[PDB]
Every structure is written in C-alpha cells, then in structure tokens.
Design a protein around this nucleic acid. Structure first.
Lengths: 49, 103, 512, 189, 124, 78, 49, 99
RNA sequence: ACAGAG
DNA sequence: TCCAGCTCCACTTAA
DNA sequence: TTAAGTGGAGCTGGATGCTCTGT
C-alpha cells in the first residue's frame, strides 16, 4: 500500500530502475520488481495463447 | 439512481415507464412464426437427387481421389499380400503439365 | 468471401480428398505462388504437391502464367470450383436435348476434366452395355454422331491446346509452355473412321493426339438463362405468349455474346417461319403479341427498329433485373411475413420515402409497420440516405429517407446462400460421421448376401441376415435416409437462388 | 514382447545430489516418473534400458539445481497384434474372462470370442465348456489360476486426462480370443 | 517431455531376463525414502515382471544361444512376428506352430514343420 | 582457439558467486575446507580464490556460436 | 529488449544475463550402451522380395 | 499513475525502510548503521545447511524480541509460516532439518 | 483535493 | 503552456 | 483549355519530476 499509516512500504521508482540497469544487475532487478512485490503463476495455454 | 448521461437526452419525458430488466436470459433458439416452403416435387426434380448420391459413390472411387499415405505400421508378416489394396495408376499428359512435377 | 473458402474446402474434400484441398484452398486464400512456397506455407512433402496440382490442373481448376526468371506460378479459380455443385444439374439438362448416349458423354467430361474423342466414345459404349441386353452392342459410331451434334450447339468445346513447339520456340524446353486458345477450331471435331463395340465387363497410333475436349460450363448457363426468362413470361400471360419468347431466344443463341444488354433484333417475317407449325396463329396474331409485350413496364422486349416489317429485340440485363427483383422480394415474404413484403415493394417503386408515407401508401398502421421497417435495416435489406440540414449531422435536425439498394442486397443475399449450402453439408457429414456404426452393420449383414452370391451359395444364408440385432435398429436408418433426401435436394435448390443472383451481378460488372 | 521407446526430457538434479555421478542420478530420477506407468501411445513403461545421449547441464537463474536434456530408451511392454502369450486366471464374471499377465491385470477374453460349444453360463460367475464324451457342461476355468493360452486380437487406448477444473479407469486395455485350436488351458493340449 | 518413436525394435524376453537380474544386483543397497512413491512404483514393477519371466522358457538361454538359434532359423523364411515367438515360447507340439505362424499348413511342408519341432528343442 | 578475452569480468564474477552461493545455501558439498564461516557467499568467495568452483561459463557470441570457459582458467581480479 | 523483460518478469539480456552457467558434473556423455542381442541386422533379413 | 508508469516499470516493494539520516565517521566507508527497530522487522530467508545449523538454532532460541533472532520458521516442502512468538522455541530449534 | 519536507 | 502529422487549396508545367 | 504534382496555411492531438508525511 501507499503510505506510512497504512504500513505501506517504499517504491522502486522509474529512475532507480534506470540505475540498476547501469550496474548490469539483472537478478537484483528481478528480485526487487518481480519476486518482492507480486510474484504469481498463470495457466497459459501453449496452443492458442 | 441517476446515471452519467442525461436520460432526458435519451427520452423518458413523462418520468415513468422504464423498460423492464431481464432476469433469465433468452434461449438459444427463439421460435419463429413462419416455416420454410416445402420442396419442389416431381419426376424431373427427383432424378437430380438420385444422381447426386451416384456422384459421391462414384467420385470417391476415382483415381483422382488421392488417399492419405499410411505410416507407422507395426511389423511385417505374411498377411500383407492378401490385404494390399490394389489400384491402378494414371499417368498425366506431360506435354501440358510443367517439367517440375515428375514423380 | 469467407463463405466461398469454407465451401471450396468441402467440395474438394468429398470429391477429391484431404491432402489435396490443402493445396487448392491455399491458392484461393493467398494468391499466386510457385511450387516450392506452396509446400512451405502448408507443411506438406514435395511429393504430395506433385500429386495435388496435377489433379487440379487436370480439371482446369488452377491456371498458370509465365513470370520473370521462368518460374511457374499457379492460381486457383474460385467460381470454377463452386460450379462442382451443379454437376447433377449439368447431366440432367443434356438428357432433355440429347439422348442417354449424350448424357454419359458430358458425365465423362465433368468427372475426368479433360478427355480425348477416342476415349470418351469408348466409355459411353462401355457403360451402356449394362443398359442393354440380348446381344445388342453399343457401337462407337452413333456416340460420335451425338458428339458432333454436341459441338454444334456448343455444349462441348475444345480445351486451350498446347501449341506446336516445332513452329514456335525450338531448342531448350520451357517450364510452362504458354498454352493458347484458338477461335476457329473450338468446335471443329477431328474426323474418325474408327468404329467398334463396347465390352460388357466380362472380367476374363491415335488420330486426335493433343485435341482435348472439356465441358463448356458457360453454355449450360446460357441454356439456364433462357429457361428463367421464358418461365417468367409464362406465368404472367399465357403459354402462347411464352413460346414467342422461346422462339426468339433459340434464334438468339448463336448471334449474341454472353454479356450483352441487347441481342440482334429479329424481324417478324422470319419469326413466323421459325415458330413451330403446331400453333394456330396467323402473322397478324404474331404482331398482336409483339406490341403488347413491349407495353409491359417489366419490359422484357423492346422495339429498337422499324425496317423489315416488325423488327423486335429482347432485353437481357433488364430481364435479369426483374428476376433479381422477384428473387429479392420472395425472401422478404417468407422471413418477415406477407405484410412486410408490401413495404419492400413500396420503397422499391417510390424510390425515396419517409415513415409517414409508408403507413399511408400501404395501409399498415403505426406500431405495426415500424417493427417491420426496423427489422429490414437490421438485416441489410433497406438503407438510409440522411439528408442533413446542417453540417453538424445531428439526428434532431435532419430527415431520414428509406431507400432500397438492389445490387448491395443482391450480393448480400447471395452471401447468405454460400453459408447455407455449407451448413447443409456439415449436417449430412455429422449424421454420417456419428452413424458409421450402423452403416457398417448394414454392410456386414449384406456382405453375406454380396460375397458368395451365386458360386456355391446355399439357401442357409438367407434367414440369418436379420438374426443380428440390427432389426429394431432399422428405424433409425430410415430416419437417416429421409434426412439425406431432404438435405441434398435442398442443396441443389439453393443453386436456383444463386444463378438468378449470379447472372444479375455478372451483367452489371464492366471489368474495366 | 518388450520393445524400446525413445523420448526426450529435462531432468532437474537438485544440488544435494552432486557428490554422486550424474549418470547414476539421472537413471534413478527417470524411473521415479516412468516406471509402472503407461505413456499413452506406447504401452506400459517398465524401466530405463540405457541413456543414449546426455547434453550439457545448464543452471538456470533462480535455482541451484542443474537441468540437463536426456535422450534415453525405455523397455516398454507392448505386444504386437496377434501375439500368442501365456497367462493366468484371477477370476470370472459374466462380462468375460479376466486374465492376469504378471505385472499387468486387464485382459479381456470376451464371450463373443470364446469357444463355440459353451457361450452363456448357468447363472454362475465361472465360465464353462461342454464336451460330449468327457466332462459334459461341468468344465470350469478354475479360480486358482492355472495357465491358459490366448491371442491378443485387439488393443485400444483411451485418453485418461482431466476434463474439467482440477479442484480411475484403465488407460491401457487389451482384448483377446481363445477360439483357435490350441488356445486355452495347457491341460487340454 | 516429447515422444520420438512408437516402435524401435523387438526384444526377446531373454534380454530383459538378464536386465532385471542385473537391476536386482545393484538394488537394495538403499531402502525406500518415503518422501513420495518414487521407489514404490519401481520395485513392484521390476519384481513382478521378473517373476513372470522366471516361469517362461526364456531361462537357461545365453546370448550365444540366441545368436545360434537365429542362425539356423535364418533360412526357414519366417518373419519377425514368427522368429520372435519360436525363441521365447518354446513350441513342442504341432498345434501351437499353426498359431505362431500364419498359413502354417500352406507355406511350410509337414516334414519342415516337424523339423521345427526339432530345430527349437535342440537349441533350448 | 578461443578468441574472447581471458579476464573474468565483474558480471561473470558476480553471477558465479551468486549461483555458487545459492548452491552452498542448499545442502551441496563444499569444495574447500571451511573454517566456521556461515554465510554462503563468503564460502563461495573462498571457493573462488582457491579456484575450485565447478561452473563452466558459456560465453555467447551474438551470431549463435559459443565458447566454454572454465572459471578456474580465467584471470580473476578485483 | 530490456523494458519488456521487466514487465514480463523474465531476466534481461544485458549485464549478468548475457551468458549461461553450466555445471561441471562428473558425467560420461555418449556412454557405453547395452548391446542388442536378438534384433541385429545380420539375423533379420526381411521375408518379402 | 497508469499501468506502464505506476505498476509495471516501477512498483511498490516490501522489505524496505525510510528514516532520517545523521553522520557517523567511526564506521567504514562501506558500512551503514541500521537501527534495532528496523533490523527486527526487516528479515532475510537464511536456508539451513550444514554450516549454519548451530547458528540458526541459537537465532531461533532468542526469538522475535531479543535482537539476533528470528520472526518466522518454515518447513521443507510446506508453504506456510509458523509465527515464532507462540509455541515453545526450544522445541522448534531441536526440530530443524536440512532445508 | 490541498499543505508540507528533502 | 510548446511541437510534429494530417488535410485543404492555389500555383505553375505540359499536353 | 485542364490534369496533375507540389508549395503553403490551418486544424489536430500529444506531452510537461521524484518520493513520503498528514487531514
């Protein structure tokens, strides 16, 4: 959630994504923006898509 | 409850008689008032119906009807010569056809 | 044309197979292709493309032209494959003007695409050995006597034949030899002194080399063009006024082209002669008919001349417009009722009309006509014009004029038919797919009758046929056959709805 | 009666099994997923015969395990049509003779393909056979399971897959015949 | 997973008699883990197969028996549906050769059929 | 011959230490003699200094070809 | 590209995501096979001509 | 505040903290002093293996209140987490497995 | 929606 | 509050 | 005389920084 009153948590912005790419950190960019927010699984049909 | 659009722009100037709300959806097959015209009968219209069955029974047996090639047969045996589906082979006129199609 | 592509994948399926329609439909769908990209854009082996194109170039369903770098590109014909449905209508209409000999001549030309004159008179002599008995043989001579009469009335024409390579381009072989059609010898048969007898199937050096014969599918359409116009004249006035139209059109066969708004006008002094002698009619009564048919605002005929006594012509494209008019109104009466078809004929004559004038001119009230007005625009039978007052085009400051467009409703109604036939083929191929259990069960119990029928056939195999459990199952097999006789017969009758629509669309296209 | 079937796979080897040789750890993992299981079009997979080609062992990001692609041949019980085996009896029923074949249990010897003198039992589950001179209508296929001889005339596969959202029939059937001379109990011939 | 071939070869039941014996030679060095059925499905399908093989006449053969049995059987003009069953099923009488070999009384002479009673039993 | 550079980059060092630390975190064998360190990344750095990590870096040239380099045969540095 | 690997949650190609790590396993590729005894080529010449 | 700038390219993460800063030169140039109130909340999943088992037993036995402690525990093939304040911790430390 | 803070 | 595309209309050459 | 390819003028649709901290 958003703010301190809601126990919100902090935001990887649009510019701190641009700094982790400059280091070439690929798995750290994956761990911050996929695993530690909203990791999920989906039933994808490989036939029709 | 009032909506985003103006109902007065749509209509309903009296203020009553809103259209009813559907509870159970309509079926897949609404019944019709009218029915199709029956078939044209006669001795001349029936012979075309007879020959059309005599084309599916004829054109499936023709050598143009290329059947799909069989594969992944299990093993060989002696019951193969009895079950070999014999059918003659037709050669085209290669003077008409291009050179690029010889077997 | 998504309906035409679905129907062509059915017509190539029952009549040619499964691994041959993938090559034919893909040329209707995509376009002109060399042989190597046909296999790549389908996924088949290179051998099967050699088998599936040689059958489609046999029956003249695909054509080809030479391009840059000598490549050979194919092209399928969409209208030519759709006329494989009218094959029983082509065999029956030659049974009228020709005998049972000529009925099996075209039937060998349509099933095999191209034949030689040496081969086609053989099989008609062969297949009519079953129709006779007691030593009487069918000879090669009288089949040719019917065959040369077929070419006189243009029902059988020569193929575009291969040219002479010794006269044109000698040397290295070209891939596609650029076939060409001549104007003189389309109907000039080669002479044959050869005769003989057909074999009765006992089961126990060529003069016409290169001269191939194929069926003229245009002449049967010109033969079906006359029977639609004459029967339209027949139902209105009289059988006596019907034959006069039949008199001119049989004379107008060899003198006009396939797409002409006006034929050559006929003088009445030779109409009286070519009219059959069994009619009690004078030359004066002949001039009575020809001035009142031109007075009809249907205008089947026109005057168009004054010299040589009574000079008279017959319209072709205006007549097909009247046939497509009666086609487009006979579908409104059966789907939306008789009173709804009153309005479609009103907006047809009174060309541009509003809501207030329809309820006056037809005596159909408010809240009964407005349902029948709105269900026709929703089915694309009637259009609007929407003349504005302002360039804002607001619906509160404009008029709405209902307007019937015939030609856009003539293509759409034809598009309804192409899906309609394919739905009939899918229903027949559904009930035959789910019931191959029962038909094999009817096959095996009759195989005891079929195999060992006479040779060593005892009488202790006649009572054991109905012993299997198929005897109460026979109620479903009679239900299966009565469905097929209503499906395949309705499958033919929609081609009558097509041909009146197909002729009206063909005569209004200029192809410039 | 055994055949080979060639398949491909991607085998996850967890990192607590790196002390052991890879070929000794691939073969155990493939038998944990294929043994006593009917792969659909090929028959009952007994065990692995040999591993024929072993590619490189990638380590993908997000895991410590190594994934390698395995080409391998599996010995599979699949008899060809009309192969004559020897089999045992488990029990009988009006639906036919239920023949056991060691590890496998679903063999159909139907009454439509039994021997001609006796076809319908006397409301007994055990099937019968009638001979005129000796043992008239009292012969029986004994439930103790003596060895018979039969001929597998028909085999048929069914797709046993989940139909519907996920929160016991046999996918490998076998139909035989006994009517030939020499097919039946070994005590008769 | 993806499947390449429905039918690759034909194995006699002697080649798996040696295989499941050699599979027992390395087994029972480690008990089952009871983390899954990973050793449950394997053990009952190796044992109950090898018990049924140990009652076939495929026992007491050798690789150099199977090679020499197919050596003498090479010229008798039999198929792979027939050369497979003569090794593993041990014909001893004349009623089973009519079943293992189709059209047995029409292709093979009665002296040559009775030779197959001697050709099988003198090797196994 | 192998034509790419023989110096280990910082990205190869980072991902080799990452994969080897995640493999030490799960119960894999340790190729060196650990002396009480509990963090898996420190043990991976001991295995990197002692040249004992069993990883083969697969360098991809962008045409499709590849080059197998061992970790213990690149010139590692700070 | 980079900005559509971050949305789809797959690791990017630049930085540490450009090379693959293999595992130096003690393994025998293309190992000694088991010999086929019955079905060889020299004993099973087919019957048909 | 759309999807492509608000929820896809940059998104709100957890295991984070934000506090006022203040100088300290007695640390090295690659160190940072995390307060105790943030270090008790921000946790790290330390997988149990052969090296750290006797360290993690003590970090479980301290519990969620004494600072070198643990806030959760999780079994091998299970996806639930047992909150370590309730129950006996010296039993859950003697029942740790590899993994 | 507004005010702050860096 | 600032800046590229899209469409309408006169303006010469050329037959 | 006019068909046509290309200039110039007005209309249109898009965009304008990163977070926490409260009411």
């Amino acid at each position: 959630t958003e703010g301190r009153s809601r126990d919100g948590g902090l935001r990887l912005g649009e510019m701190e994504r641009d700094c982790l790419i400059g280091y070439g950190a690929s798995m750290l960019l994956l761990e911050r923006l996929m695993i530690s927010s909203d990791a999920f699984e989906v039933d994808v049909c490989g036939q029709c898509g | 409850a009032a909506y985003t659009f103006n109902i007065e722009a749509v209509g309903f100037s009296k203020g009553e008689k809103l259209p009813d709300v559907v509870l159970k959806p309509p079926p897949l097959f609404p019944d019709t008032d009218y029915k199709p015209v029956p078939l044209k009968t006669g001795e001349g219209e029936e012979y075309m119906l007879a020959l059309k069955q005599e084309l599916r029974e004829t054109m499936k047996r023709m050598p143009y009807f290329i059947e799909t090639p069989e594969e992944r047969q299990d093993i060989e045996r002696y019951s193969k010569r009895y079950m070999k589906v014999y059918k003659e082979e037709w050669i085209p006129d290669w003077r008409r056809l291009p050179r690029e199609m010889m077997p | 044309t998504q309906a035409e592509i679905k129907l062509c994948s059915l017509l190539l399926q029952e009549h040619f197979g499964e691994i041959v329609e993938k090559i034919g439909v893909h040329l209707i769908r995509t376009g002109s292709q060399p042989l190597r990209v046909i296999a790549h854009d389908t996924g088949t082996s290179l051998d099967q493309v050699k088998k599936a194109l040689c059958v489609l170039v046999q029956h003249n369903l695909v054509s080809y032209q030479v391009h840059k770098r000598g490549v050979v590109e194919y092209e399928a014909q969409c209208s030519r494959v759709l006329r494989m449905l009218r094959y029983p209508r082509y065999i029956y209409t030659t049974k009228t003007l020709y005998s049972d000999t000529g009925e099996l001549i075209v039937e060998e030309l349509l099933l095999n695409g191209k034949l030689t004159m040496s081969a086609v008179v053989k099989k008609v002599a062969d297949r009519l050995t079953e129709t006779m008995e007691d030593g009487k043989t069918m000879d090669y001579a009288e089949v040719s006597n019917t065959f040369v009469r077929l070419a006189d009335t243009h029902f059988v024409q020569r193929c575009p034949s291969v040219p002479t390579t010794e006269n044109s381009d000698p040397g290295p072989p070209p891939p596609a030899p650029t076939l060409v059609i001549n104007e003189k010898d389309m109907y000039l048969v080669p002479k044959l002194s050869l005769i003989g007898k057909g074999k009765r199937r006992r089961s126990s050096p060529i003069p016409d080399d290169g001269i191939y014969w194929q069926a003229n599918l245009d002449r049967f359409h010109q033969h079906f063009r006359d029977q639609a116009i004459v029967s339209a004249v027949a139902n209105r006035m009289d059988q006596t006024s019907s034959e006069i139209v039949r008199t001119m059109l049989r004379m107008s066969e060899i003198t006009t082209s396939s797409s002409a708004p006006f034929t050559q006008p006929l003088s009445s002094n030779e109409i009286f002669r070519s009219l059959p002698v069994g009619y009690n009619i004078s030359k004066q009564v002949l001039d009575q008919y020809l001035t009142l048919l031109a007075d009809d605002p249907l205008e089947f005929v026109g005057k168009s001349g004054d010299s040589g006594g009574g000079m008279y012509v017959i319209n072709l494209h205006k007549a097909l417009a009247s046939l497509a008019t009666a086609t487009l109104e006979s579908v409104v009466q059966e789907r939306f009722g008789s009173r709804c078809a009153r309005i479609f004929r009103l907006v047809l004559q009174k060309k541009h009309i509003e809501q207030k004038q329809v309820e006056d001119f037809a005596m159909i009230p408010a809240k009964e006509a407005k349902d029948m007005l709105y269900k026709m625009l929703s089915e694309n039978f009637m259009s609007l014009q929407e003349i504005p007052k302002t360039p804002d085009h607001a619906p509160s400051r404009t008029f709405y004029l209902y307007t019937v467009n015939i030609l856009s409703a003539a293509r759409m109604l034809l598009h309804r038919c192409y899906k309609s036939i394919a739905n009939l083929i899918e229903r027949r191929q559904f009930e035959t797919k789910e019931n191959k259990r029962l038909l094999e069960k009817s096959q095996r119990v009759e195989a005891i009758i079929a195999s060992m029928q006479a040779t060593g056939a005892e009488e202790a195999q006649l009572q054991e046929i109905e012993e299997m459990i198929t005897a109460p199952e026979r109620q479903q097999l009679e239900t299966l056959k009565r469905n097929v006789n209503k499906l395949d017969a309705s499958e033919i009758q929609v081609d009558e709805t097509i041909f009146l629509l197909e002729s009206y669309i063909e005569c209004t296209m200029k192809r410039q | 009666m055994f055949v080979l079937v060639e398949m491909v796979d991607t085998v996850r080897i967890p990192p607590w099994q790196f002390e052991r040789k890879l070929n000794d750890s691939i073969a155990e993992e493939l038998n944990k997923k294929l043994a006593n299981k009917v792969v659909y079009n090929v028959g009952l997979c007994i065990c692995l015969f040999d591993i024929t080609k072993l590619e490189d062992a990638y380590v993908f990001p997000g895991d410590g395990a190594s994934h390698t692609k395995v080409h391998f041949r599996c010995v599979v019980f699949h008899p060809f049509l009309d192969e004559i085996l020897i089999g045992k009896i488990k029990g009988c029923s009006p639906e036919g003779v239920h023949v056991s074949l060691g590890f496998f249990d679903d063999i159909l010897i139907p009454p439509e393909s039994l021997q001609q003198p006796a076809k319908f039992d006397e409301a007994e589950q055990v099937w019968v056979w009638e001979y005129e001179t000796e043992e008239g209508a009292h012969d029986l296929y004994m439930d103790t399971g003596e060895e018979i001889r039969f001929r597998v005339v028909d085999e048929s596969f069914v797709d046993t897959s989940p139909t519907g959202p996920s929160s016991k029939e046999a996918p490998y059937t076998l139909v035989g015949s006994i009517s030939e001379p020499g097919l039946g109990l070994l005590s008769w011939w | 997973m993806e499947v390449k071939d429905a039918n690759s070869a034909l194995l006699s039941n002697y080649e798996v008699f040696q295989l499941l014996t050699d599979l027992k030679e390395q087994r029972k060095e480690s008990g089952k883990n009871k983390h899954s059925s990973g050793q449950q499905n394997l053990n009952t399908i190796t044992y109950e197969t090898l018990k049924y093989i140990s009652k076939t006449p495929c026992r007491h053969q050798s690789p150099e028996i199977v090679r020499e049995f197919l050596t003498a059987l090479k010229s008798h003009k039999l198929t792979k549906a027939e050369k497979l069953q003569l090794l593993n099923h041990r014909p001893v009488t004349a009623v089973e050769i009519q079943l293992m070999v189709e059209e047995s009384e029409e292709r093979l002479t009665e002296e040559q059929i009775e030779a197959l009673l001697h050709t099988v039993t003198s090797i196994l | 011959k192998r034509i790419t550079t023989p110096y280990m980059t910082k990205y190869e060092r980072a991902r080799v230490l990452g994969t080897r630390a995640l493999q030490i975190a799960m119960c894999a064998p340790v190729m060196v003699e650990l002396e009480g360190e509990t963090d898996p990344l420190l043990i991976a750095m001991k295995e990197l200094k002692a040249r004992k990590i069993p990883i083969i870096i697969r360098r991809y040239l962008p045409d499709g070809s590849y080059e197998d380099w061992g970790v213990d045969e690149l010139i590692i540095t700070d | 590209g980079v900005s559509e690997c971050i949305i789809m949650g797959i690791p990017m190609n630049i930085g540490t995501g450009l090379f693959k790590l293999l595992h130096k396993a003690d393994r025998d590729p293309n190992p000694p096979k088991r010999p086929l005894i019955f079905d060889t080529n020299e004993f099973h010449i087919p019957l048909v001509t | 505040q759309g999807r492509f700038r608000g929820n896809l390219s940059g998104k709100r993460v957890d295991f984070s903290g934000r506090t006022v800063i203040s100088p300290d030169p007695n640390l090295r140039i690659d160190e940072v002093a995390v307060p105790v109130h943030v270090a008790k909340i921000l946790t790290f999943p330390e997988k149990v293996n052969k090296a750290n088992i006797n360290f993690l037993r003590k970090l479980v036995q301290n519990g969620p209140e004494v600072h070198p402690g643990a806030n959760f525990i999780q079994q091998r093939h299970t996806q639930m987490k047992r909150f370590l304040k309730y129950g006996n911790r010296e039993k859950m430390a003697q029942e740790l497995k590899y993994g």
